[PDB]
Amino acid sequence: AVADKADNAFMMICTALVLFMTIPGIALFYGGLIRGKNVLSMLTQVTVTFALVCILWVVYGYSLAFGEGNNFFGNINWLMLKNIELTAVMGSIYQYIHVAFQGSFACITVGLIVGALAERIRFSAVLIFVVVWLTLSYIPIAHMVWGGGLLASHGALDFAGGTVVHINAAIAGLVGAYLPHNLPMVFTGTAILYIGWFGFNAGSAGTANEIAALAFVNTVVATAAAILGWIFGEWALRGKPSLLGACSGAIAGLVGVTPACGYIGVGGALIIGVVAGLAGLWGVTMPCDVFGVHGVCGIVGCIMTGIFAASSLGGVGFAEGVTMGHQLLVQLESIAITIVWSGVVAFIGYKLADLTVGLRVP
Amino acid sequence: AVADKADNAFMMICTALVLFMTIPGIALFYGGLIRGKNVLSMLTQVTVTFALVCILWVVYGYSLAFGEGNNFFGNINWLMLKNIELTAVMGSIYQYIHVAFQGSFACITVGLIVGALAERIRFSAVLIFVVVWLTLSYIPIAHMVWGGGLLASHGALDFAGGTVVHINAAIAGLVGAYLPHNLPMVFTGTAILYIGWFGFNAGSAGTANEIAALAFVNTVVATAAAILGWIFGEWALRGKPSLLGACSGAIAGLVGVTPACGYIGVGGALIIGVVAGLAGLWGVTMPCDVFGVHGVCGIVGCIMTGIFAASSLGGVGFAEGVTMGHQLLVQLESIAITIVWSGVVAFIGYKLADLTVGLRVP
Amino acid sequence: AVADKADNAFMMICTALVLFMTIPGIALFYGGLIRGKNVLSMLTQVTVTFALVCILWVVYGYSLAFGEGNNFFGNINWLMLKNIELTAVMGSIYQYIHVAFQGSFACITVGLIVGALAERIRFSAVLIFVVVWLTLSYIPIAHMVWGGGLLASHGALDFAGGTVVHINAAIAGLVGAYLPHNLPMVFTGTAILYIGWFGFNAGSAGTANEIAALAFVNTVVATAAAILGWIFGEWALRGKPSLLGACSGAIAGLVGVTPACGYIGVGGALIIGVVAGLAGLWGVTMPCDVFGVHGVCGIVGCIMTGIFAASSLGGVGFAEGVTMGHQLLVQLESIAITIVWSGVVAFIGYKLADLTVGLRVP
């Protein structure tokens, strides 16, 4: 295998766009939602934990997520990237670029959790939790889905991380919760998240090809359909649209199309978008509401991927010998496994912090 | 024709940059200019109409703008992108990428109009207007200039949309008008518009070649020359420069070089920049002032393209058998047609809304 | 030599990212630090001087920096880019793209100086200074390091501008000084600087290859290590971390890895990051503090490059026949020359302005 320079270029720029989603996208999103007296401390926590994830990833994270091992974890052969030649190729790009791209996914996943709970948790406690949950939840689930583990081996479909990123993070946020002063700032964060999400979704193709093109167009369409679905529902129930409603609808569509984007047709993208925007509004009606959107819209997206990948409905098609019924059962099992795995690990992380330093802010 | 992956990569990233111009560039620009009590509602209108344009484009917009038809419109053969194979090539890129790029141009054009008039117009009325004006003005003019229609057939020169985007939108804004509390926010929006404009101007080449390179350098030079021309004029007339003056000068140069950027030399870019910055200041002296800059600077740019494309002046050269006099007459005719076409359609759109829901805010 | 379109694409996008560092990155960074009554005037000065640098670069700047001449300056053969054919290739890209990329480096260097001193200096005086210092300091030092001049001829290692950008600007700021109201704004500027810095560091490879990949990964790692080093030091000395501390640590790592990024291993990047973050904190303890970070962290970075380029330590290796001792001596000499050259020229610029218009604000 030799590296293609067009693919090297595309994938480095997509990596920069995903890093932009955390620094400053998710920080500004939460910054406009929470109480003003809490903004400075939350911004500090997001920045410090981002740095921590970047370091853990290179020391051992990449090796245990993407090295060859078993169904649940990889190996320790790639510690500090040892034994990876600079000219080594993964797919059609230099392996060093694959390291950076996958690291940026771990960063945004952790940013989602830390932003929402920074108000309520002690600084030393959040650091302990991130170390436990990244090592024992993010890494294994990434291995299972994208690193040749249990879920991949059974043919699960998840293009850009409905399970790995969204459901994984949403469950961890909810467990923590159990244990808007500046709307122009919220809008600015939403917009930066949207633009960076093209790197997130299209970059998951690993090459500047027709599947990257499909994922790009589907991202535009599903986001737009979800803005419109949320806003219509808000007009019907509340009498009029709102700015926070429009931004929430955008996020709902982006989350919903995440697992599906490289597998479905544009018609499918429009239908997934509308359903996701409405499911999101239902979800928040029943800033920890962000875990309601990422969780509900993630499950909806993962199920609907097992429908709209069908050739009959404009998709790329299921694998050889796989019926729609079979794919649907596999999607359901992958969602169930992600929920229980993340839920158990988070509980352990929060409890270990509480025994060592105490959880609640002094 | 086979797709080139370097061109696929370049054009997907340029599309993301043009979407960044609307979400959040133009929204933050207007957000700092208008009254504070009106900011939230304007941001909501920009976001909802952006979603509407994205959907209309994929349902029928692309087909009637870029399909083969007559001098004024295309066809309905590409509804919801039916009959476009995923591997179909347009120029040197996948056709799906061309769909996304051209859609992003329709979005920024509509954002220019909606941002300025959101204070004054009822929500349901703006939705009606966008549907009428996009369908009957944006689409036909795009077909005429870039889709093999009337103006292209007569050899009109317009690299990135002096007519299609700027004059088209400026006239529609002026008809509506007939019928700064946060300057750091205005500066931030201006800066995001500038950075995204490299995707807008260089991406109009359709490939990562020497014409894309020329357009890039000309964008840097004309923007800088227009900042300096506006600021000098402000010092002469008002006694000193201002922040709003500097931002306005930047926009003036960007608008002026839009039709010319892929056809002229760097010397030509510097001259066009200076004249545009001064014409812009004259224009505002005689946030609906934004329609004064986009309109005056658009006309100036379109005329000056018919001069500075000449080989003698450092340009790429006129087509075979075309004198400078002939090109100039064709530029003038293209400007006249755009003004009357947009003016008539806008009047019809505003009037239909007024008869159905009433125009003015309740 | 023929141009590679993948490299053309990569280098145009990296240029847009470096322009983003000045407009609006450095402007927002300083905007949150200085007194509120001074913000508008500083933003105006940054914008006008940016335009001035763009014009001077194309008129004569590129020619005297990158044309063939002597050890200290180039020539006047490329005035207004005359005699450069549109299809001319430099390395593996069109020469017009090289012009734009190198111009963006001159812009950020000047932005660093103007942002910090805008409060204190008269407008007409800053314009005079920029003209003198760009022409007689930035241009010659760029020629010496990257244009085949004195320092390159002796084998100096400086991948992305520890001398040319950071030490050069830091000394000029300090000479001027001799002669935080909005922390969310400071965080936003820091984040935009970080994202743009991938274009700055990876783009310095000139191609989308394995050296660009190495520079990208090293940027992620050194920034993260420096955030952690600064924050630890702040906890030890001050009792707790702060938002301004975290942002300062990020900048320290970015500056430190600038000269080293394309030459060192990931282990080396982590060590350079930690040392830079701690040296930065020491430096500020002993907004002109920004010249303390860029100066101290620049020197540290330039020295440590002469160590960690060694094959033994995971680097790409020294040139044929060059020991670690020899490279270290050459690094020290390059730092000494940059300090004295910039220091002398700045003194002359500030003095000429003071004799013509007066330096201090009226």
PDB file of N, CA, C and O in Angstrom, chain B residues 4 6-7 10 13 183 187-188 191 194-195 198 207-210 212-214 216-217 220-221 224-225 227-228 241 243 266-267, chain C residues 5-6 8-9 12-13 15-16 19-20 23-24 27-28 40 43-44 47-48 50-51 54-55 58 80 86-87 94 96-97 123:
ATOM      1  N   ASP B   4     -11.054  13.461 -10.348  1.00  0.00           N
ATOM      2  CA  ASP B   4      -9.726  13.650  -9.766  1.00  0.00           C
ATOM      3  C   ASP B   4      -9.873  13.889  -8.259  1.00  0.00           C
ATOM      4  O   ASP B   4     -10.539  14.848  -7.843  1.00  0.00           O
ATOM      5  N   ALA B   6      -7.847  15.000  -5.906  1.00  0.00           N
ATOM      6  CA  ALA B   6      -7.325  16.298  -5.435  1.00  0.00           C
ATOM      7  C   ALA B   6      -8.380  17.382  -5.621  1.00  0.00           C
ATOM      8  O   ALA B   6      -8.581  18.205  -4.731  1.00  0.00           O
ATOM      9  N   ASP B   7      -9.046  17.376  -6.777  1.00  0.00           N
ATOM     10  CA  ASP B   7     -10.150  18.316  -7.044  1.00  0.00           C
ATOM     11  C   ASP B   7     -11.387  18.048  -6.146  1.00  0.00           C
ATOM     12  O   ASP B   7     -12.024  19.003  -5.659  1.00  0.00           O
ATOM     13  N   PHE B  10     -10.406  19.542  -2.611  1.00  0.00           N
ATOM     14  CA  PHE B  10     -10.435  21.008  -2.675  1.00  0.00           C
ATOM     15  C   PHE B  10     -11.868  21.554  -2.654  1.00  0.00           C
ATOM     16  O   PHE B  10     -12.179  22.493  -1.902  1.00  0.00           O
ATOM     17  N   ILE B  13     -13.909  21.049   0.723  1.00  0.00           N
ATOM     18  CA  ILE B  13     -13.448  22.041   1.737  1.00  0.00           C
ATOM     19  C   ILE B  13     -13.931  23.471   1.385  1.00  0.00           C
ATOM     20  O   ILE B  13     -14.353  24.222   2.277  1.00  0.00           O
ATOM     21  N   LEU B 183     -19.872  46.619  17.967  1.00  0.00           N
ATOM     22  CA  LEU B 183     -18.865  46.633  16.892  1.00  0.00           C
ATOM     23  C   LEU B 183     -17.859  45.453  16.901  1.00  0.00           C
ATOM     24  O   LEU B 183     -17.469  44.989  15.827  1.00  0.00           O
ATOM     25  N   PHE B 187     -17.094  43.176  13.609  1.00  0.00           N
ATOM     26  CA  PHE B 187     -15.728  42.809  13.171  1.00  0.00           C
ATOM     27  C   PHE B 187     -15.572  41.277  13.030  1.00  0.00           C
ATOM     28  O   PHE B 187     -14.980  40.781  12.066  1.00  0.00           O
ATOM     29  N   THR B 188     -16.105  40.535  13.997  1.00  0.00           N
ATOM     30  CA  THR B 188     -16.028  39.060  13.975  1.00  0.00           C
ATOM     31  C   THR B 188     -16.754  38.472  12.749  1.00  0.00           C
ATOM     32  O   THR B 188     -16.220  37.589  12.063  1.00  0.00           O
ATOM     33  N   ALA B 191     -14.725  39.211   9.545  1.00  0.00           N
ATOM     34  CA  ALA B 191     -13.560  38.314   9.457  1.00  0.00           C
ATOM     35  C   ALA B 191     -13.916  36.902   8.948  1.00  0.00           C
ATOM     36  O   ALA B 191     -13.212  36.352   8.097  1.00  0.00           O
ATOM     37  N   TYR B 194     -14.661  37.110   5.230  1.00  0.00           N
ATOM     38  CA  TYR B 194     -13.371  37.182   4.507  1.00  0.00           C
ATOM     39  C   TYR B 194     -12.711  35.798   4.290  1.00  0.00           C
ATOM     40  O   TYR B 194     -12.356  35.431   3.141  1.00  0.00           O
ATOM     41  N   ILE B 195     -12.529  35.054   5.381  1.00  0.00           N
ATOM     42  CA  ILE B 195     -11.935  33.699   5.330  1.00  0.00           C
ATOM     43  C   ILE B 195     -12.772  32.728   4.453  1.00  0.00           C
ATOM     44  O   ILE B 195     -12.230  32.052   3.564  1.00  0.00           O
ATOM     45  N   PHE B 198     -12.536  32.891   0.415  1.00  0.00           N
ATOM     46  CA  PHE B 198     -11.516  32.154  -0.373  1.00  0.00           C
ATOM     47  C   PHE B 198     -12.103  30.868  -1.018  1.00  0.00           C
ATOM     48  O   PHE B 198     -11.781  30.517  -2.177  1.00  0.00           O
ATOM     49  N   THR B 207     -11.390  23.312  -9.660  1.00  0.00           N
ATOM     50  CA  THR B 207     -10.181  22.480  -9.669  1.00  0.00           C
ATOM     51  C   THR B 207      -9.036  23.206  -8.937  1.00  0.00           C
ATOM     52  O   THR B 207      -8.977  24.433  -8.948  1.00  0.00           O
ATOM     53  N   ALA B 208      -8.131  22.453  -8.310  1.00  0.00           N
ATOM     54  CA  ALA B 208      -6.953  23.053  -7.652  1.00  0.00           C
ATOM     55  C   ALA B 208      -5.791  23.349  -8.634  1.00  0.00           C
ATOM     56  O   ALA B 208      -4.708  22.746  -8.548  1.00  0.00           O
ATOM     57  N   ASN B 209      -6.025  24.286  -9.557  1.00  0.00           N
ATOM     58  CA  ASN B 209      -5.063  24.623 -10.616  1.00  0.00           C
ATOM     59  C   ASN B 209      -4.513  26.067 -10.533  1.00  0.00           C
ATOM     60  O   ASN B 209      -4.625  26.720  -9.490  1.00  0.00           O
ATOM     61  N   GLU B 210      -3.927  26.549 -11.629  1.00  0.00           N
ATOM     62  CA  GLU B 210      -3.307  27.877 -11.655  1.00  0.00           C
ATOM     63  C   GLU B 210      -4.331  29.026 -11.701  1.00  0.00           C
ATOM     64  O   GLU B 210      -4.020  30.161 -11.318  1.00  0.00           O
ATOM     65  N   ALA B 212      -7.377  28.770  -9.995  1.00  0.00           N
ATOM     66  CA  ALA B 212      -7.643  28.841  -8.545  1.00  0.00           C
ATOM     67  C   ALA B 212      -6.583  29.655  -7.771  1.00  0.00           C
ATOM     68  O   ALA B 212      -6.941  30.475  -6.903  1.00  0.00           O
ATOM     69  N   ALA B 213      -5.298  29.435  -8.092  1.00  0.00           N
ATOM     70  CA  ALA B 213      -4.176  30.190  -7.498  1.00  0.00           C
ATOM     71  C   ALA B 213      -4.264  31.698  -7.792  1.00  0.00           C
ATOM     72  O   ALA B 213      -4.055  32.533  -6.895  1.00  0.00           O
ATOM     73  N   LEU B 214      -4.593  32.030  -9.041  1.00  0.00           N
ATOM     74  CA  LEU B 214      -4.747  33.425  -9.476  1.00  0.00           C
ATOM     75  C   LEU B 214      -5.886  34.088  -8.716  1.00  0.00           C
ATOM     76  O   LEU B 214      -5.737  35.208  -8.222  1.00  0.00           O
ATOM     77  N   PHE B 216      -7.129  33.262  -5.818  1.00  0.00           N
ATOM     78  CA  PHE B 216      -6.739  33.367  -4.399  1.00  0.00           C
ATOM     79  C   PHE B 216      -5.913  34.641  -4.136  1.00  0.00           C
ATOM     80  O   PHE B 216      -6.264  35.449  -3.264  1.00  0.00           O
ATOM     81  N   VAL B 217      -4.826  34.813  -4.893  1.00  0.00           N
ATOM     82  CA  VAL B 217      -3.945  35.989  -4.779  1.00  0.00           C
ATOM     83  C   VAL B 217      -4.693  37.310  -5.059  1.00  0.00           C
ATOM     84  O   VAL B 217      -4.530  38.294  -4.319  1.00  0.00           O
ATOM     85  N   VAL B 220      -6.808  38.368  -1.926  1.00  0.00           N
ATOM     86  CA  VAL B 220      -5.955  39.022  -0.929  1.00  0.00           C
ATOM     87  C   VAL B 220      -5.673  40.488  -1.304  1.00  0.00           C
ATOM     88  O   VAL B 220      -5.850  41.389  -0.472  1.00  0.00           O
ATOM     89  N   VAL B 221      -5.245  40.712  -2.549  1.00  0.00           N
ATOM     90  CA  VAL B 221      -4.817  42.035  -3.022  1.00  0.00           C
ATOM     91  C   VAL B 221      -5.976  43.055  -3.109  1.00  0.00           C
ATOM     92  O   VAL B 221      -5.847  44.184  -2.631  1.00  0.00           O
ATOM     93  N   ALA B 224      -7.339  44.181   0.422  1.00  0.00           N
ATOM     94  CA  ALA B 224      -6.383  45.071   1.079  1.00  0.00           C
ATOM     95  C   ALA B 224      -6.411  46.482   0.496  1.00  0.00           C
ATOM     96  O   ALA B 224      -6.373  47.467   1.246  1.00  0.00           O
ATOM     97  N   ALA B 225      -6.485  46.572  -0.838  1.00  0.00           N
ATOM     98  CA  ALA B 225      -6.531  47.854  -1.557  1.00  0.00           C
ATOM     99  C   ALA B 225      -7.803  48.652  -1.248  1.00  0.00           C
ATOM    100  O   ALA B 225      -7.772  49.885  -1.192  1.00  0.00           O
ATOM    101  N   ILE B 227      -9.743  48.250   1.655  1.00  0.00           N
ATOM    102  CA  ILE B 227      -9.606  48.710   3.036  1.00  0.00           C
ATOM    103  C   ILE B 227      -8.860  50.053   3.038  1.00  0.00           C
ATOM    104  O   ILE B 227      -9.310  51.021   3.655  1.00  0.00           O
ATOM    105  N   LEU B 228      -7.730  50.117   2.331  1.00  0.00           N
ATOM    106  CA  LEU B 228      -6.923  51.344   2.284  1.00  0.00           C
ATOM    107  C   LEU B 228      -7.609  52.541   1.592  1.00  0.00           C
ATOM    108  O   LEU B 228      -7.510  53.674   2.070  1.00  0.00           O
ATOM    109  N   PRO B 241     -10.095  57.641  10.499  1.00  0.00           N
ATOM    110  CA  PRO B 241     -10.687  56.330  10.204  1.00  0.00           C
ATOM    111  C   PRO B 241     -11.568  55.794  11.341  1.00  0.00           C
ATOM    112  O   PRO B 241     -11.469  56.268  12.475  1.00  0.00           O
ATOM    113  N   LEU B 243     -13.602  51.871  12.857  1.00  0.00           N
ATOM    114  CA  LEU B 243     -13.704  50.416  12.732  1.00  0.00           C
ATOM    115  C   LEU B 243     -14.762  49.979  11.716  1.00  0.00           C
ATOM    116  O   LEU B 243     -14.494  49.095  10.896  1.00  0.00           O
ATOM    117  N   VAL B 266      -2.630  40.813 -11.118  1.00  0.00           N
ATOM    118  CA  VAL B 266      -2.546  41.413  -9.768  1.00  0.00           C
ATOM    119  C   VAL B 266      -2.608  42.947  -9.781  1.00  0.00           C
ATOM    120  O   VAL B 266      -3.171  43.552  -8.863  1.00  0.00           O
ATOM    121  N   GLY B 267      -2.040  43.560 -10.821  1.00  0.00           N
ATOM    122  CA  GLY B 267      -2.147  45.006 -11.030  1.00  0.00           C
ATOM    123  C   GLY B 267      -3.597  45.440 -11.162  1.00  0.00           C
ATOM    124  O   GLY B 267      -4.026  46.418 -10.533  1.00  0.00           O
TER     125      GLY B 267
ATOM    126  N   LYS C   5      -1.573  18.631  -8.055  1.00  0.00           N
ATOM    127  CA  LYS C   5      -2.863  19.251  -7.626  1.00  0.00           C
ATOM    128  C   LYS C   5      -3.261  18.980  -6.158  1.00  0.00           C
ATOM    129  O   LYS C   5      -3.959  19.802  -5.535  1.00  0.00           O
ATOM    130  N   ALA C   6      -2.842  17.832  -5.618  1.00  0.00           N
ATOM    131  CA  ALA C   6      -3.066  17.522  -4.192  1.00  0.00           C
ATOM    132  C   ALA C   6      -2.296  18.505  -3.319  1.00  0.00           C
ATOM    133  O   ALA C   6      -2.829  18.995  -2.326  1.00  0.00           O
ATOM    134  N   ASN C   8      -1.235  21.568  -4.363  1.00  0.00           N
ATOM    135  CA  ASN C   8      -1.909  22.869  -4.626  1.00  0.00           C
ATOM    136  C   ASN C   8      -3.124  23.084  -3.692  1.00  0.00           C
ATOM    137  O   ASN C   8      -3.294  24.153  -3.088  1.00  0.00           O
ATOM    138  N   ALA C   9      -3.966  22.060  -3.593  1.00  0.00           N
ATOM    139  CA  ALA C   9      -5.149  22.075  -2.711  1.00  0.00           C
ATOM    140  C   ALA C   9      -4.799  22.263  -1.226  1.00  0.00           C
ATOM    141  O   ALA C   9      -5.345  23.162  -0.571  1.00  0.00           O
ATOM    142  N   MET C  12      -3.218  25.940  -0.573  1.00  0.00           N
ATOM    143  CA  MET C  12      -4.248  26.998  -0.576  1.00  0.00           C
ATOM    144  C   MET C  12      -5.101  27.001   0.722  1.00  0.00           C
ATOM    145  O   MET C  12      -5.349  28.064   1.306  1.00  0.00           O
ATOM    146  N   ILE C  13      -5.529  25.826   1.176  1.00  0.00           N
ATOM    147  CA  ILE C  13      -6.318  25.730   2.438  1.00  0.00           C
ATOM    148  C   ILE C  13      -5.463  26.130   3.667  1.00  0.00           C
ATOM    149  O   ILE C  13      -5.955  26.828   4.566  1.00  0.00           O
ATOM    150  N   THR C  15      -2.984  28.252   3.667  1.00  0.00           N
ATOM    151  CA  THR C  15      -2.871  29.721   3.573  1.00  0.00           C
ATOM    152  C   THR C  15      -4.106  30.415   4.189  1.00  0.00           C
ATOM    153  O   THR C  15      -3.959  31.396   4.938  1.00  0.00           O
ATOM    154  N   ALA C  16      -5.309  29.927   3.868  1.00  0.00           N
ATOM    155  CA  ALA C  16      -6.543  30.462   4.461  1.00  0.00           C
ATOM    156  C   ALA C  16      -6.534  30.331   5.992  1.00  0.00           C
ATOM    157  O   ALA C  16      -6.931  31.265   6.688  1.00  0.00           O
ATOM    158  N   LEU C  19      -4.163  33.051   7.449  1.00  0.00           N
ATOM    159  CA  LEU C  19      -4.836  34.364   7.435  1.00  0.00           C
ATOM    160  C   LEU C  19      -5.878  34.514   8.587  1.00  0.00           C
ATOM    161  O   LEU C  19      -6.009  35.593   9.182  1.00  0.00           O
ATOM    162  N   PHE C  20      -6.580  33.416   8.889  1.00  0.00           N
ATOM    163  CA  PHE C  20      -7.556  33.266  10.014  1.00  0.00           C
ATOM    164  C   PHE C  20      -6.882  33.560  11.383  1.00  0.00           C
ATOM    165  O   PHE C  20      -7.503  34.157  12.269  1.00  0.00           O
ATOM    166  N   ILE C  23      -6.884  37.538  11.253  1.00  0.00           N
ATOM    167  CA  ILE C  23      -8.253  38.034  11.037  1.00  0.00           C
ATOM    168  C   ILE C  23      -9.251  36.861  11.232  1.00  0.00           C
ATOM    169  O   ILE C  23      -9.509  36.094  10.290  1.00  0.00           O
ATOM    170  N   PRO C  24      -9.835  36.723  12.449  1.00  0.00           N
ATOM    171  CA  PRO C  24      -9.771  37.589  13.647  1.00  0.00           C
ATOM    172  C   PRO C  24      -8.979  37.089  14.885  1.00  0.00           C
ATOM    173  O   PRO C  24      -9.072  37.723  15.948  1.00  0.00           O
ATOM    174  N   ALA C  27      -6.540  39.520  16.942  1.00  0.00           N
ATOM    175  CA  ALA C  27      -7.360  40.683  17.290  1.00  0.00           C
ATOM    176  C   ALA C  27      -8.304  40.411  18.473  1.00  0.00           C
ATOM    177  O   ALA C  27      -8.440  41.250  19.361  1.00  0.00           O
ATOM    178  N   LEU C  28      -8.944  39.236  18.486  1.00  0.00           N
ATOM    179  CA  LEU C  28      -9.823  38.852  19.602  1.00  0.00           C
ATOM    180  C   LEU C  28      -9.018  38.522  20.873  1.00  0.00           C
ATOM    181  O   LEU C  28      -9.444  38.863  21.980  1.00  0.00           O
ATOM    182  N   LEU C  40     -11.836  49.301  20.417  1.00  0.00           N
ATOM    183  CA  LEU C  40     -12.218  49.721  19.061  1.00  0.00           C
ATOM    184  C   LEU C  40     -11.037  50.233  18.229  1.00  0.00           C
ATOM    185  O   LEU C  40     -10.859  49.832  17.071  1.00  0.00           O
ATOM    186  N   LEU C  43      -8.588  47.336  17.278  1.00  0.00           N
ATOM    187  CA  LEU C  43      -9.151  46.527  16.187  1.00  0.00           C
ATOM    188  C   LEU C  43      -8.977  47.222  14.819  1.00  0.00           C
ATOM    189  O   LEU C  43      -8.663  46.560  13.821  1.00  0.00           O
ATOM    190  N   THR C  44      -9.148  48.542  14.801  1.00  0.00           N
ATOM    191  CA  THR C  44      -8.922  49.369  13.605  1.00  0.00           C
ATOM    192  C   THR C  44      -7.457  49.331  13.143  1.00  0.00           C
ATOM    193  O   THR C  44      -7.190  49.096  11.959  1.00  0.00           O
ATOM    194  N   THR C  47      -6.494  45.886  11.644  1.00  0.00           N
ATOM    195  CA  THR C  47      -7.105  45.701  10.324  1.00  0.00           C
ATOM    196  C   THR C  47      -6.387  46.518   9.220  1.00  0.00           C
ATOM    197  O   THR C  47      -6.102  45.981   8.141  1.00  0.00           O
ATOM    198  N   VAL C  48      -6.096  47.793   9.500  1.00  0.00           N
ATOM    199  CA  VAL C  48      -5.428  48.700   8.529  1.00  0.00           C
ATOM    200  C   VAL C  48      -3.971  48.277   8.238  1.00  0.00           C
ATOM    201  O   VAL C  48      -3.531  48.298   7.081  1.00  0.00           O
ATOM    202  N   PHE C  50      -2.723  45.203   8.593  1.00  0.00           N
ATOM    203  CA  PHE C  50      -2.862  43.941   7.832  1.00  0.00           C
ATOM    204  C   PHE C  50      -2.966  44.225   6.325  1.00  0.00           C
ATOM    205  O   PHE C  50      -2.232  43.635   5.525  1.00  0.00           O
ATOM    206  N   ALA C  51      -3.865  45.139   5.955  1.00  0.00           N
ATOM    207  CA  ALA C  51      -4.001  45.594   4.559  1.00  0.00           C
ATOM    208  C   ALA C  51      -2.678  46.148   3.997  1.00  0.00           C
ATOM    209  O   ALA C  51      -2.275  45.811   2.880  1.00  0.00           O
ATOM    210  N   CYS C  54      -0.177  43.244   3.257  1.00  0.00           N
ATOM    211  CA  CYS C  54      -0.605  42.538   2.033  1.00  0.00           C
ATOM    212  C   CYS C  54      -0.137  43.259   0.747  1.00  0.00           C
ATOM    213  O   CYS C  54       0.347  42.605  -0.184  1.00  0.00           O
ATOM    214  N   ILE C  55      -0.270  44.589   0.709  1.00  0.00           N
ATOM    215  CA  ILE C  55       0.139  45.395  -0.452  1.00  0.00           C
ATOM    216  C   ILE C  55       1.667  45.480  -0.613  1.00  0.00           C
ATOM    217  O   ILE C  55       2.189  45.221  -1.702  1.00  0.00           O
ATOM    218  N   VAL C  58       3.275  42.209  -2.082  1.00  0.00           N
ATOM    219  CA  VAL C  58       3.125  41.981  -3.522  1.00  0.00           C
ATOM    220  C   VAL C  58       3.938  42.982  -4.359  1.00  0.00           C
ATOM    221  O   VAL C  58       4.547  42.592  -5.360  1.00  0.00           O
ATOM    222  N   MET C  80       5.766  43.613  -8.265  1.00  0.00           N
ATOM    223  CA  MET C  80       4.359  43.340  -8.630  1.00  0.00           C
ATOM    224  C   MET C  80       4.188  41.987  -9.334  1.00  0.00           C
ATOM    225  O   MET C  80       3.290  41.804 -10.162  1.00  0.00           O
ATOM    226  N   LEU C  86       2.200  32.483 -14.914  1.00  0.00           N
ATOM    227  CA  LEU C  86       1.121  31.936 -14.085  1.00  0.00           C
ATOM    228  C   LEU C  86       1.301  30.437 -13.796  1.00  0.00           C
ATOM    229  O   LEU C  86       0.924  29.947 -12.717  1.00  0.00           O
ATOM    230  N   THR C  87       1.906  29.731 -14.752  1.00  0.00           N
ATOM    231  CA  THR C  87       2.145  28.287 -14.630  1.00  0.00           C
ATOM    232  C   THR C  87       3.513  27.914 -14.020  1.00  0.00           C
ATOM    233  O   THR C  87       3.877  26.735 -13.992  1.00  0.00           O
ATOM    234  N   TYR C  94       2.200  25.636  -7.642  1.00  0.00           N
ATOM    235  CA  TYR C  94       2.291  26.885  -8.432  1.00  0.00           C
ATOM    236  C   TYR C  94       2.887  28.009  -7.574  1.00  0.00           C
ATOM    237  O   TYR C  94       2.542  28.165  -6.388  1.00  0.00           O
ATOM    238  N   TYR C  96       2.517  31.207  -7.539  1.00  0.00           N
ATOM    239  CA  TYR C  96       1.472  32.095  -6.973  1.00  0.00           C
ATOM    240  C   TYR C  96       0.952  31.658  -5.587  1.00  0.00           C
ATOM    241  O   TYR C  96       0.660  32.515  -4.738  1.00  0.00           O
ATOM    242  N   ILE C  97       0.862  30.342  -5.354  1.00  0.00           N
ATOM    243  CA  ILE C  97       0.453  29.798  -4.042  1.00  0.00           C
ATOM    244  C   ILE C  97       1.545  30.013  -2.981  1.00  0.00           C
ATOM    245  O   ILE C  97       1.240  30.356  -1.840  1.00  0.00           O
ATOM    246  N   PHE C 123      -1.604  56.550  15.671  1.00  0.00           N
ATOM    247  CA  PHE C 123      -1.936  55.801  14.445  1.00  0.00           C
ATOM    248  C   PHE C 123      -0.908  56.017  13.324  1.00  0.00           C
ATOM    249  O   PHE C 123      -0.419  55.053  12.732  1.00  0.00           O
TER     250      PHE C 123
END
